Design an enzyme around this catalytic site. Structure first.
Site, short mmCIF file in Angstrom:
data_model
loop_
_atom_site.label_atom_id
_atom_site.label_comp_id
_atom_site.label_asym_id
_atom_site.label_seq_id
_atom_site.Cartn_x
_atom_site.Cartn_y
_atom_site.Cartn_z
N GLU A 222 1.01 -1.16 0.08
CA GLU A 222 -0.17 0.01 -0.06
C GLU A 222 0.84 1.37 0.08
O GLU A 222 0.58 2.00 -0.82
CB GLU A 222 -0.80 -0.07 1.22
N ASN B 40 -7.81 9.54 -5.62
CA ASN B 40 -8.73 8.67 -6.21
C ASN B 40 -9.56 9.59 -7.24
O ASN B 40 -9.71 10.84 -7.14
CB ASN B 40 -9.62 7.54 -5.41
N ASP C 219 -12.96 9.53 -7.78
CA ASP C 219 -13.97 10.20 -6.88
C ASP C 219 -13.62 11.35 -6.28
O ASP C 219 -14.50 11.89 -5.34
CB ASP C 219 -14.72 8.94 -5.97
N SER D 68 -11.59 11.56 -3.55
CA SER D 68 -10.99 10.93 -1.89
C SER D 68 -9.74 10.61 -2.11
O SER D 68 -9.02 10.76 -3.28
CB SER D 68 -12.00 9.92 -1.42
N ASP E 227 -6.16 8.65 -0.36
CA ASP E 227 -5.76 7.57 0.71
C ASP E 227 -4.48 8.26 1.64
O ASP E 227 -3.48 8.59 0.85
CB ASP E 227 -5.39 6.36 0.01
N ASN F 52 -8.78 5.44 3.42
CA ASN F 52 -9.40 6.40 2.64
C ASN F 52 -10.57 7.53 3.24
O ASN F 52 -11.11 7.29 3.83
CB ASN F 52 -10.38 5.39 1.58
N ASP G 148 -15.22 -4.33 9.63
CA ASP G 148 -16.55 -3.79 8.81
C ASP G 148 -17.37 -4.73 8.26
O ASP G 148 -18.33 -4.37 7.86
CB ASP G 148 -16.15 -2.33 8.35
#
EC number: 3.2.1.17
Length: 129
Positions: free
Chosen positions: A35, A46, A48, A50, A52, A59, A101
């Protein structure tokens, strides 16, 4: 801070990630390697809108507040900048929530594509733990 492989392994274990939610330490170290290449200051944007952040590339659409991701959530209840620190406590506290989650470690795309189903034990080889 760019962590050394075994250095991170120790920090992660200390923070209670070994076998957290059934995932052995090797999984967590492999996920960090792919990562962010063990760099706590890594950031990626990203499509969209957003971003990281950090060692685990958490995110902004769902987990932290960066003030520039309209209509996003802040499930970890922290500013995203907290995830860039040399001290991995915030990144770990937040990861524990993510992994619980429902999707497990699949939440980390590098984990699913490069760590999942591999011999993750190799990532902790030679470490004094």
């Amino acid at each position: 801070k760019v962590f050394g492989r075994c250095e991170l392994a120790a920090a992660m274990k200390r923070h209670g990630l070994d076998n957290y939610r059934g995932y052995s330490l090797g999984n967590w170290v492999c996920a960090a390697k792919f990562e962010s290449n063990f760099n706590t200051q890594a950031t990626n944007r990203n499509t969209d809108g957003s971003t990281d952040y950090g060692i685990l590339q958490i995110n902004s659409r769902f987990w932290c507040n960066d003030g520039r991701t309209p209509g996003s959530r802040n499930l970890c209840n922290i500013p995203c900048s907290a995830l860039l620190s040399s001290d991995i406590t915030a990144s770990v506290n937040c990861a524990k929530k993510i992994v619980s989650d429902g999707n497990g470690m699949n939440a980390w795309v590098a984990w699913r594509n490069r760590c999942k189903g591999t011999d993750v034990q190799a990532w902790i080889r030679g470490c004094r733990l």
